Short mmCIF file of C-alpha atoms in Angstrom, two decimals:
data_model
loop_
_atom_site.label_atom_id
_atom_site.label_comp_id
_atom_site.label_asym_id
_atom_site.label_seq_id
_atom_site.Cartn_x
_atom_site.Cartn_y
_atom_site.Cartn_z
CA UNK A 1 -10.86 124.78 -24.79
CA UNK A 2 -7.43 124.88 -23.20
CA UNK A 3 -5.83 127.80 -21.32
CA UNK A 4 -2.27 127.79 -22.73
CA UNK A 5 -0.60 129.08 -19.51
CA UNK A 6 -2.34 126.56 -17.19
CA UNK A 7 -1.40 123.75 -19.59
CA UNK A 8 2.17 125.12 -19.51
CA UNK A 9 2.08 125.19 -15.65
CA UNK A 10 1.06 121.50 -15.63
CA UNK A 11 3.78 120.49 -18.10
CA UNK A 12 6.38 122.30 -15.92
CA UNK A 13 5.21 120.45 -12.82
CA UNK A 14 5.30 117.10 -14.62
CA UNK A 15 8.83 117.85 -15.88
CA UNK A 16 10.06 118.76 -12.38
CA UNK A 17 8.78 115.35 -11.01
CA UNK A 18 11.23 113.47 -13.28
CA UNK A 19 14.52 112.74 -11.48
CA UNK A 20 16.66 114.14 -14.29
CA UNK A 21 14.85 117.53 -14.02
CA UNK A 22 14.13 117.64 -10.26
CA UNK A 23 16.36 120.80 -10.02
CA UNK A 24 16.32 122.61 -13.37
CA UNK A 25 17.35 126.08 -14.52
CA UNK A 26 15.05 128.27 -16.61
CA UNK A 27 17.01 127.44 -19.75
CA UNK A 28 16.78 123.68 -19.18
CA UNK A 29 13.00 123.89 -18.76
CA UNK A 30 12.44 126.15 -21.78
CA UNK A 31 14.59 123.91 -23.95
CA UNK A 32 12.96 120.69 -22.82
CA UNK A 33 9.39 122.06 -23.21
CA UNK A 34 10.07 124.04 -26.42
CA UNK A 35 8.83 127.46 -25.24
CA UNK A 36 10.79 130.72 -25.00
CA UNK A 37 12.42 131.68 -21.70
CA UNK A 38 10.14 134.66 -21.03
CA UNK A 39 6.93 132.60 -21.30
CA UNK A 40 8.36 129.94 -18.93
CA UNK A 41 9.64 132.45 -16.43
CA UNK A 42 6.22 134.11 -16.13
CA UNK A 43 4.61 130.73 -15.33
CA UNK A 44 7.44 129.67 -13.05
CA UNK A 45 7.25 132.93 -11.10
CA UNK A 46 3.49 132.66 -10.62
CA UNK A 47 3.89 129.07 -9.53
CA UNK A 48 6.70 130.15 -7.15
CA UNK A 49 4.50 132.78 -5.45
CA UNK A 50 1.89 130.06 -4.75
CA UNK A 51 4.64 127.69 -3.44
CA UNK A 52 3.87 125.12 -6.18
CA UNK A 53 7.48 125.59 -7.22
CA UNK A 54 10.53 126.40 -5.19
CA UNK A 55 13.56 128.35 -6.41
CA UNK A 56 17.09 128.21 -5.08
CA UNK A 57 18.79 131.47 -5.99
CA UNK A 58 22.22 129.96 -5.16
CA UNK A 59 21.85 127.42 -8.06
CA UNK A 60 19.30 129.33 -10.17
CA UNK A 61 17.29 126.03 -10.08
CA UNK A 62 13.57 125.40 -9.75
CA UNK A 63 12.02 122.33 -8.15
CA UNK A 64 8.63 121.11 -6.97
CA UNK A 65 7.47 123.23 -4.07
CA UNK A 66 6.15 122.69 -0.59
CA UNK A 67 2.49 123.45 -1.35
CA UNK A 68 2.18 120.27 -3.39
CA UNK A 69 2.75 118.18 -0.21
CA UNK A 70 -0.55 118.91 1.57
CA UNK A 71 -2.27 119.25 -1.79
CA UNK A 72 -1.27 115.72 -2.76
CA UNK A 73 -2.00 114.31 0.65
CA UNK A 74 -5.54 115.84 0.41
CA UNK A 75 -6.06 114.46 -3.11
CA UNK A 76 -5.45 111.06 -1.54
CA UNK A 77 -7.42 111.35 1.67
CA UNK A 78 -10.47 113.40 0.52
CA UNK A 79 -11.31 110.72 -2.06
CA UNK A 80 -12.55 107.41 -0.65
CA UNK A 81 -11.20 105.40 -3.58
CA UNK A 82 -7.63 106.71 -3.43
CA UNK A 83 -7.42 106.77 0.42
CA UNK A 84 -8.34 103.08 0.69
CA UNK A 85 -6.28 101.92 -2.30
CA UNK A 86 -3.11 103.59 -0.89
CA UNK A 87 -3.80 101.99 2.52
CA UNK A 88 -4.24 98.63 0.77
CA UNK A 89 -0.71 98.88 -0.76
CA UNK A 90 0.70 98.68 2.77
CA UNK A 91 -1.43 95.56 3.38
CA UNK A 92 -0.25 93.92 0.16
CA UNK A 93 3.45 94.67 0.83
CA UNK A 94 3.35 93.53 4.43
CA UNK A 95 1.64 90.17 3.56
CA UNK A 96 3.54 89.32 0.35
CA UNK A 97 7.00 90.72 1.16
CA UNK A 98 6.96 92.46 -2.27
CA UNK A 99 6.88 96.08 -3.32
CA UNK A 100 3.29 97.04 -4.07
CA UNK A 101 2.24 99.73 -6.56
CA UNK A 102 -0.94 101.58 -7.60
CA UNK A 103 -1.16 102.25 -11.32
CA UNK A 104 -3.61 104.75 -12.81
CA UNK A 105 -4.92 105.20 -16.40
CA UNK A 106 -4.47 108.76 -17.73
CA UNK A 107 -5.47 110.43 -20.94
CA UNK A 108 -3.50 109.81 -24.19
CA UNK A 109 -2.91 106.05 -23.57
CA UNK A 110 -0.52 106.69 -20.66
CA UNK A 111 -0.50 105.28 -17.11
CA UNK A 112 1.23 106.47 -13.97
CA UNK A 113 2.53 105.12 -10.67
CA UNK A 114 0.31 106.89 -8.12
CA UNK A 115 2.06 105.41 -5.07
CA UNK A 116 3.94 102.45 -3.65
CA UNK A 117 4.64 100.71 -0.43
CA UNK A 118 7.84 98.81 0.31
CA UNK A 119 7.74 95.80 2.63
CA UNK A 120 8.20 96.82 6.25
CA UNK A 121 11.31 96.22 8.30
CA UNK A 122 14.76 95.78 6.90
CA UNK A 123 16.50 94.09 3.97
CA UNK A 124 16.95 95.30 0.42
CA UNK A 125 13.81 96.60 -1.13
CA UNK A 126 12.86 97.19 -4.71
CA UNK A 127 11.94 100.85 -5.15
CA UNK A 128 9.99 102.41 -8.01
CA UNK A 129 9.90 106.02 -9.13
CA UNK A 130 6.53 107.32 -7.97
CA UNK A 131 4.95 109.44 -10.70
CA UNK A 132 6.74 107.66 -13.54
CA UNK A 133 4.58 107.38 -16.69
CA UNK A 134 4.31 104.31 -18.94
CA UNK A 135 2.52 103.34 -22.14
CA UNK A 136 -0.86 101.81 -21.30
CA UNK A 137 0.23 98.56 -22.99
CA UNK A 138 3.43 97.86 -20.95
CA UNK A 139 4.18 94.87 -18.64
CA UNK A 140 1.66 93.17 -16.28
CA UNK A 141 -0.35 96.33 -15.55
CA UNK A 142 -0.76 97.15 -19.23
CA UNK A 143 -2.63 93.90 -19.83
CA UNK A 144 -4.85 94.53 -16.79
CA UNK A 145 -5.97 97.82 -18.35
CA UNK A 146 -6.30 96.55 -21.91
CA UNK A 147 -7.99 93.19 -21.33
CA UNK A 148 -11.30 94.84 -20.29
CA UNK A 149 -11.35 97.69 -22.85
CA UNK A 150 -13.70 97.70 -25.84
CA UNK A 151 -11.72 96.80 -29.01
CA UNK A 152 -11.96 100.50 -30.04
CA UNK A 153 -9.06 100.96 -27.55
CA UNK A 154 -7.30 97.57 -28.29
CA UNK A 155 -6.70 98.24 -31.92
CA UNK A 156 -5.67 101.95 -31.80
CA UNK A 157 -2.78 101.18 -29.39
CA UNK A 158 -1.70 97.95 -31.15
CA UNK A 159 -1.66 99.95 -34.45
CA UNK A 160 0.69 102.62 -32.91
CA UNK A 161 3.28 99.85 -32.31
CA UNK A 162 4.56 98.24 -29.14
CA UNK A 163 7.95 99.50 -27.85
CA UNK A 164 10.48 96.75 -26.97
CA UNK A 165 11.90 97.86 -23.60
CA UNK A 166 13.83 94.58 -23.07
CA UNK A 167 14.24 91.36 -25.03
CA UNK A 168 11.16 89.86 -23.27
CA UNK A 169 8.82 92.76 -24.00
CA UNK A 170 5.83 91.42 -25.94
CA UNK A 171 5.89 93.18 -29.32
CA UNK A 172 4.06 90.54 -31.47
CA UNK A 173 0.44 91.72 -31.78
CA UNK A 174 -1.01 88.18 -32.02
CA UNK A 175 0.84 86.91 -28.93
CA UNK A 176 -0.32 89.98 -27.03
CA UNK A 177 -3.97 89.37 -27.94
CA UNK A 178 -3.81 85.72 -26.69
CA UNK A 179 -2.30 87.03 -23.39
CA UNK A 180 -5.19 89.52 -23.05
CA UNK A 181 -7.63 86.56 -23.38
CA UNK A 182 -5.61 84.85 -20.66
CA UNK A 183 -5.89 87.88 -18.33
CA UNK A 184 -9.71 87.87 -18.68
CA UNK A 185 -9.95 84.19 -17.70
CA UNK A 186 -7.49 84.25 -14.78
CA UNK A 187 -8.12 87.78 -13.49
CA UNK A 188 -4.42 88.60 -13.19
CA UNK A 189 -1.23 88.99 -15.22
CA UNK A 190 2.42 88.11 -14.65
CA UNK A 191 5.43 89.72 -16.42
CA UNK A 192 9.05 88.56 -16.19
CA UNK A 193 11.53 91.24 -17.20
CA UNK A 194 9.17 92.81 -19.76
CA UNK A 195 9.90 96.37 -18.52
CA UNK A 196 13.10 96.11 -16.41
CA UNK A 197 15.54 93.18 -16.68
CA UNK A 198 15.41 91.08 -13.47
CA UNK A 199 12.06 92.45 -12.26
CA UNK A 200 8.86 90.41 -12.29
CA UNK A 201 5.42 91.63 -11.40
CA UNK A 202 1.94 90.41 -10.65
CA UNK A 203 -0.93 92.75 -11.51
CA UNK A 204 -4.71 92.72 -10.88
CA UNK A 205 -7.40 95.04 -12.23
CA UNK A 206 -9.65 97.14 -9.96
CA UNK A 207 -13.07 97.26 -11.65
CA UNK A 208 -14.98 100.59 -11.79
CA UNK A 209 -18.79 100.91 -12.16
CA UNK A 210 -18.67 100.14 -15.95
CA UNK A 211 -16.73 96.82 -15.57
CA UNK A 212 -13.76 98.83 -16.92
CA UNK A 213 -10.31 99.40 -15.43
CA UNK A 214 -9.01 102.78 -14.26
CA UNK A 215 -6.70 101.39 -11.54
CA UNK A 216 -4.40 98.38 -11.36
CA UNK A 217 -2.69 97.08 -8.21
CA UNK A 218 0.74 95.54 -8.72
CA UNK A 219 3.40 93.53 -6.90
CA UNK A 220 7.08 93.69 -7.75
CA UNK A 221 9.97 91.33 -7.02
CA UNK A 222 13.20 89.94 -8.44
CA UNK A 223 12.73 87.38 -11.17
CA UNK A 224 15.61 85.25 -9.80
CA UNK A 225 13.87 84.91 -6.38
CA UNK A 226 10.19 84.45 -7.37
CA UNK A 227 8.70 80.94 -6.81
CA UNK A 228 5.16 79.67 -7.60
CA UNK A 229 4.04 80.17 -3.99
CA UNK A 230 5.02 83.87 -4.32
CA UNK A 231 2.78 84.33 -7.35
CA UNK A 232 -0.15 82.67 -5.51
CA UNK A 233 0.33 84.85 -2.41
CA UNK A 234 0.57 88.01 -4.54
CA UNK A 235 -2.61 87.08 -6.45
CA UNK A 236 -4.62 86.52 -3.26
CA UNK A 237 -3.45 89.76 -1.62
CA UNK A 238 -3.91 91.80 -4.77
CA UNK A 239 -7.34 90.33 -5.57
CA UNK A 240 -8.62 90.82 -2.03
CA UNK A 241 -7.32 94.43 -1.98
CA UNK A 242 -8.79 95.04 -5.46
CA UNK A 243 -12.27 93.90 -4.41
CA UNK A 244 -12.21 96.25 -1.39
CA UNK A 245 -11.22 99.19 -3.66
CA UNK A 246 -13.94 98.35 -6.23
CA UNK A 247 -16.42 98.38 -3.35
CA UNK A 248 -15.62 102.09 -2.83
CA UNK A 249 -15.89 103.00 -6.59
CA UNK A 250 -19.67 103.66 -6.13
CA UNK B 1 4.24 142.41 -12.09
CA UNK B 2 4.54 141.40 -15.75
CA UNK B 3 5.67 137.92 -14.66
CA UNK B 4 2.36 137.40 -12.82
CA UNK B 5 0.02 135.10 -14.91
CA UNK B 6 -3.59 135.44 -13.65
CA UNK B 7 -4.89 132.14 -15.12
CA UNK B 8 -2.19 130.13 -13.27
CA UNK B 9 -2.92 132.07 -10.07
CA UNK B 10 -6.60 131.04 -10.46
CA UNK B 11 -5.67 127.40 -11.14
CA UNK B 12 -3.80 127.45 -7.81
CA UNK B 13 -6.76 129.04 -5.97
CA UNK B 14 -9.10 126.41 -7.48
CA UNK B 15 -6.88 123.58 -6.25
CA UNK B 16 -6.46 125.11 -2.82
CA UNK B 17 -10.26 125.35 -2.53
CA UNK B 18 -10.90 121.75 -3.61
CA UNK B 19 -8.51 120.58 -0.90
CA UNK B 20 -10.90 121.78 1.85
CA UNK B 21 -13.08 118.96 3.15
CA UNK B 22 -16.17 121.13 2.75
CA UNK B 23 -15.54 121.92 -0.95
CA UNK B 24 -14.01 118.53 -1.91
CA UNK B 25 -16.78 117.77 -4.41
CA UNK B 26 -17.86 121.19 -5.76
CA UNK B 27 -20.10 122.30 -8.66
CA UNK B 28 -18.94 124.98 -11.08
CA UNK B 29 -21.35 127.50 -9.48
CA UNK B 30 -20.16 126.85 -5.92
CA UNK B 31 -16.51 127.24 -7.06
CA UNK B 32 -17.08 130.46 -9.03
CA UNK B 33 -19.19 132.04 -6.29
CA UNK B 34 -16.72 131.08 -3.51
CA UNK B 35 -13.71 132.49 -5.39
CA UNK B 36 -15.64 135.55 -6.66
CA UNK B 37 -14.65 134.85 -10.27
CA UNK B 38 -16.75 134.80 -13.43
CA UNK B 39 -18.07 131.21 -14.05
CA UNK B 40 -16.85 131.04 -17.66
CA UNK B 41 -13.30 131.99 -16.60
CA UNK B 42 -13.52 129.13 -14.08
CA UNK B 43 -14.78 126.58 -16.57
CA UNK B 44 -11.85 127.05 -18.92
CA UNK B 45 -9.29 126.60 -16.12
CA UNK B 46 -11.12 123.63 -14.58
CA UNK B 47 -11.43 121.83 -17.90
CA UNK B 48 -7.72 122.57 -18.64
CA UNK B 49 -6.76 121.11 -15.23
CA UNK B 50 -9.04 118.10 -15.88
CA UNK B 51 -7.27 117.42 -19.19
CA UNK B 52 -3.93 117.10 -17.32
CA UNK B 53 -5.59 114.97 -14.53
CA UNK B 54 -4.95 117.66 -11.83
CA UNK B 55 -8.77 117.88 -11.37
CA UNK B 56 -11.54 115.33 -11.93
CA UNK B 57 -15.17 115.72 -12.83
CA UNK B 58 -18.04 113.38 -12.00
CA UNK B 59 -20.64 113.63 -14.83
CA UNK B 60 -23.47 112.35 -12.52
CA UNK B 61 -23.33 115.00 -9.77
CA UNK B 62 -21.51 117.62 -11.92
CA UNK B 63 -18.87 118.12 -9.21
CA UNK B 64 -15.14 118.71 -9.47
CA UNK B 65 -12.48 117.41 -7.12
CA UNK B 66 -8.74 117.12 -6.70
CA UNK B 67 -7.39 114.89 -9.48
CA UNK B 68 -4.99 111.94 -9.05
CA UNK B 69 -1.84 113.47 -10.62
CA UNK B 70 -1.43 115.63 -7.49
CA UNK B 71 -0.68 112.48 -5.42
CA UNK B 72 2.66 111.56 -7.06
CA UNK B 73 3.58 115.25 -7.37
CA UNK B 74 3.14 115.58 -3.62
CA UNK B 75 5.23 112.49 -2.97
CA UNK B 76 8.04 113.63 -5.27
CA UNK B 77 8.03 117.16 -3.81
CA UNK B 78 8.25 115.78 -0.20
CA UNK B 79 10.87 113.25 -1.23
CA UNK B 80 13.19 116.04 -2.51
CA UNK B 81 12.52 118.43 0.39
CA UNK B 82 9.94 117.65 3.03
CA UNK B 83 8.02 120.25 5.10
CA UNK B 84 10.62 120.34 7.88
CA UNK B 85 13.40 121.02 5.26
CA UNK B 86 11.32 123.88 3.78
CA UNK B 87 10.62 125.12 7.28
CA UNK B 88 14.38 125.23 7.99
CA UNK B 89 14.94 127.19 4.76
CA UNK B 90 12.35 129.77 5.75
CA UNK B 91 14.11 130.05 9.17
CA UNK B 92 17.28 131.16 7.39
CA UNK B 93 15.24 133.93 5.72
CA UNK B 94 13.97 135.01 9.15
CA UNK B 95 17.48 134.98 10.58
CA UNK B 96 18.69 137.07 7.60
CA UNK B 97 15.88 139.65 7.89
CA UNK B 98 16.01 139.89 11.74
CA UNK B 99 19.76 139.35 12.52
CA UNK B 100 18.51 136.88 15.21
CA UNK B 101 18.97 133.19 15.71
CA UNK B 102 15.85 131.43 14.49
CA UNK B 103 14.65 128.13 15.88
CA UNK B 104 12.13 125.44 14.97
CA UNK B 105 10.35 123.93 18.04
CA UNK B 106 8.25 120.74 18.03
CA UNK B 107 5.83 119.33 20.52
CA UNK B 108 6.45 115.93 22.16
CA UNK B 109 4.34 113.75 24.38
CA UNK B 110 4.45 114.26 28.15
CA UNK B 111 4.50 118.07 28.32
CA UNK B 112 7.86 118.46 26.57
CA UNK B 113 9.00 120.40 23.53
CA UNK B 114 12.19 119.98 21.50
CA UNK B 115 14.44 122.10 19.25
CA UNK B 116 14.57 120.32 15.86
CA UNK B 117 16.53 122.90 13.82
CA UNK B 118 18.15 126.34 13.95
CA UNK B 119 19.51 129.00 11.64
CA UNK B 120 22.08 131.50 12.80
CA UNK B 121 22.04 134.89 11.02
CA UNK B 122 24.57 135.31 8.15
CA UNK B 123 28.07 136.78 8.41
CA UNK B 124 30.89 136.38 10.84
CA UNK B 125 31.09 137.50 14.49
CA UNK B 126 29.25 136.33 17.58
CA UNK B 127 25.85 134.73 17.64
CA UNK B 128 23.60 132.75 19.91
CA UNK B 129 23.80 129.03 19.22
CA UNK B 130 21.36 126.39 20.51
CA UNK B 131 21.52 122.63 20.83
CA UNK B 132 19.32 120.81 18.35
CA UNK B 133 17.79 118.09 20.56
CA UNK B 134 17.38 120.11 23.75
CA UNK B 135 14.02 119.46 25.36
CA UNK B 136 12.03 121.85 27.53
CA UNK B 137 8.74 121.93 29.39
CA UNK B 138 5.76 122.95 27.25
CA UNK B 139 5.13 126.01 29.50
CA UNK B 140 8.66 127.45 29.21
CA UNK B 141 9.09 130.95 27.76
CA UNK B 142 7.64 132.42 24.50
CA UNK B 143 7.59 129.16 22.56
CA UNK B 144 5.91 127.25 25.41
CA UNK B 145 3.06 129.76 25.52
CA UNK B 146 2.56 129.40 21.75
CA UNK B 147 1.80 125.66 22.14
CA UNK B 148 -0.28 126.00 25.32
CA UNK B 149 -2.41 128.99 24.41
CA UNK B 150 -4.04 126.89 21.67
CA UNK B 151 -4.94 123.86 23.81
CA UNK B 152 -8.24 123.55 25.67
CA UNK B 153 -8.35 125.57 28.88
CA UNK B 154 -8.52 122.24 30.80
CA UNK B 155 -4.86 121.71 29.81
CA UNK B 156 -3.96 125.20 31.03
CA UNK B 157 -5.46 124.35 34.39
CA UNK B 158 -3.72 120.96 34.54
CA UNK B 159 -0.30 122.45 33.72
CA UNK B 160 -0.84 125.29 36.21
CA UNK B 161 -2.00 123.05 39.07
CA UNK B 162 1.17 120.91 38.52
CA UNK B 163 3.46 123.88 39.18
CA UNK B 164 5.31 126.34 36.99
CA UNK B 165 9.03 125.93 37.70
CA UNK B 166 10.97 129.16 38.28
CA UNK B 167 14.19 129.07 36.16
CA UNK B 168 15.10 132.73 36.73
CA UNK B 169 13.85 135.81 38.65
CA UNK B 170 11.81 136.78 35.52
CA UNK B 171 10.05 133.42 35.22
CA UNK B 172 6.29 133.66 35.35
CA UNK B 173 5.05 131.57 38.24
CA UNK B 174 1.95 133.69 39.15
CA UNK B 175 -1.04 131.63 37.90
CA UNK B 176 -3.36 134.59 37.23
CA UNK B 177 -0.55 136.31 35.22
CA UNK B 178 0.21 133.16 33.19
CA UNK B 179 -3.46 132.72 32.22
CA UNK B 180 -3.54 136.39 31.15
CA UNK B 181 -0.37 135.76 29.08
CA UNK B 182 -1.96 132.69 27.44
CA UNK B 183 -5.14 134.63 26.69
CA UNK B 184 -3.19 137.45 25.05
CA UNK B 185 -1.06 135.02 23.01
CA UNK B 186 -4.33 133.54 21.72
CA UNK B 187 -5.76 137.07 21.05
CA UNK B 188 -2.47 138.31 19.35
CA UNK B 189 -0.89 135.31 17.59
CA UNK B 190 2.64 135.61 19.09
CA UNK B 191 4.54 135.61 22.43
CA UNK B 192 7.54 137.43 23.85
CA UNK B 193 9.66 136.43 26.83
CA UNK B 194 12.56 138.31 28.46
CA UNK B 195 14.92 136.12 30.41
CA UNK B 196 12.33 133.50 31.38
CA UNK B 197 14.62 130.51 30.72
CA UNK B 198 18.06 132.11 30.26
CA UNK B 199 19.26 135.30 31.90
CA UNK B 200 19.98 137.87 29.14
CA UNK B 201 18.07 136.08 26.37
CA UNK B 202 14.81 137.20 24.78
CA UNK B 203 12.42 135.18 22.61
CA UNK B 204 9.70 136.00 20.09
CA UNK B 205 7.56 133.09 18.96
CA UNK B 206 4.69 132.32 16.64
CA UNK B 207 2.62 129.16 16.28
CA UNK B 208 2.39 126.95 13.14
CA UNK B 209 -1.03 125.35 12.66
CA UNK B 210 -1.71 122.06 10.86
CA UNK B 211 -4.75 120.59 9.10
CA UNK B 212 -6.65 119.93 12.39
CA UNK B 213 -5.84 123.52 13.43
CA UNK B 214 -3.59 122.27 16.26
CA UNK B 215 -0.10 123.63 17.07
CA UNK B 216 2.60 120.99 16.44
CA UNK B 217 5.38 123.45 15.59
CA UNK B 218 6.54 126.87 16.74
CA UNK B 219 8.94 129.25 15.04
CA UNK B 220 11.01 131.33 17.43
CA UNK B 221 13.77 133.99 17.39
CA UNK B 222 16.42 134.36 20.10
CA UNK B 223 18.32 137.55 20.81
CA UNK B 224 20.10 139.24 23.72
CA UNK B 225 17.76 141.33 25.83
CA UNK B 226 20.32 143.99 26.62
CA UNK B 227 20.72 145.05 22.96
CA UNK B 228 17.12 144.84 21.73
CA UNK B 229 16.04 148.21 20.24
CA UNK B 230 12.87 150.02 19.04
CA UNK B 231 11.80 148.23 15.92
CA UNK B 232 13.60 144.89 16.52
CA UNK B 233 10.82 143.00 18.24
CA UNK B 234 8.18 144.45 15.92
CA UNK B 235 10.30 143.33 12.94
CA UNK B 236 10.78 139.78 14.15
CA UNK B 237 7.07 139.30 14.89
CA UNK B 238 6.30 140.39 11.33
CA UNK B 239 8.94 138.03 9.80
CA UNK B 240 7.96 135.05 12.02
CA UNK B 241 4.28 135.55 11.11
CA UNK B 242 4.99 135.71 7.36
CA UNK B 243 7.00 132.50 7.73
CA UNK B 244 4.53 130.77 10.06
CA UNK B 245 1.64 131.48 7.68
CA UNK B 246 3.60 129.71 4.89
CA UNK B 247 4.64 126.70 6.99
CA UNK B 248 1.03 126.47 8.31
CA UNK B 249 -0.18 126.26 4.70
CA UNK B 250 2.52 123.52 4.09
CA UNK B 251 1.32 121.60 7.15
CA UNK B 252 -2.18 121.56 5.58
CA UNK B 253 -3.76 124.48 7.53
CA UNK B 254 -6.58 126.28 5.65
#
């Protein structure tokens, strides 16, 4: 079963976390979600009374509300796995000088940025959109998820087709399979401009109790600046952090 | 109201419950009994939330918990408008409903407090303005008593032994009176001062609690003493409490 209104409440919240829809009128939400204005408004008003959504009558725009702040903080700190993994991002960033990210496998072959940490102190930083979703196959993290799946999950997602985000996105199914073999041997993956042009990443799987991968830790930097020593550093930090997070997955 | 959707209200109650340390890993029975809702009704909502990753389920122990999608929602919500921003917005509501200047006070180290935001009531004419950044002693006036009343009594005794400084003729410097005033603030949930820091100025204040049940923030209303009337103080207490309850929930109080 599915309760249609609760599912609609969730879709609204997910829509309002995208930058384009961070402040959206009723009509923009209805249109984007494909439901009539009255059904949306009912949900939005119930969500508003609980402070899950906020409403600015001066702009007639709805946004994510204040109650999600402590709710999200608690979802992090009440769970041993998430509390330690988010703390580890700060470790990774401080020791590598790269922007560190936690990626999480969702239902329907999607993944999501759960959090990030930017290196401390000053300078330009690379910043990611926290809460952005991605296909489970994309860039360095995609291969960290897929390399330890049973081939029941390999083939279904390969068969759907691989989107070419940039000219270096891996869309050849055979090349992708060889790279998955490579991830298993080395325990990490590197992408150069596969998702965003000029961005490279290093990713490492965090193993759950089934030897499977629900969480990936990632490091991000500019492709033009990355040297071999940077990859090695990122791999050590990420691997060490990953092993501490796996420890808590009991 | 016809725009009130009971299944989404229950989803919210479920998530608020799972955010309490005690109920962080809760069986279906414990959830349904604690909320006073039929277990089947609960299952459908829980499983719907689980499908969207707002809740998780552990098949071993049969317990539900806050799901991981709430983490980036929280971060994106705060990034747009953080708690202090929302607190300021609620102060403008208070100012509008009371016709008083509303003020957000924060505790510092070393027995000081500081104004971190204000909201003058709407319209044109005169009004009381305050300096964002002004610091005061933690014992001073209505807002001082709202911080102190909720510390251990050992702090009351320390602050009292170290001397209450008399700013005006209406300042409370009698130790037995100040203790009685702290006790009653703790009994009643608000404080009122009449010319204790500034001649002519009255204050009504209410504490904001956080997730360790401590008072880091106080919401306060300033008005002129000489024009306060019957229902005014009563009305401001009621508006400040409605606002402080909300901001307490946003600071993680439960």
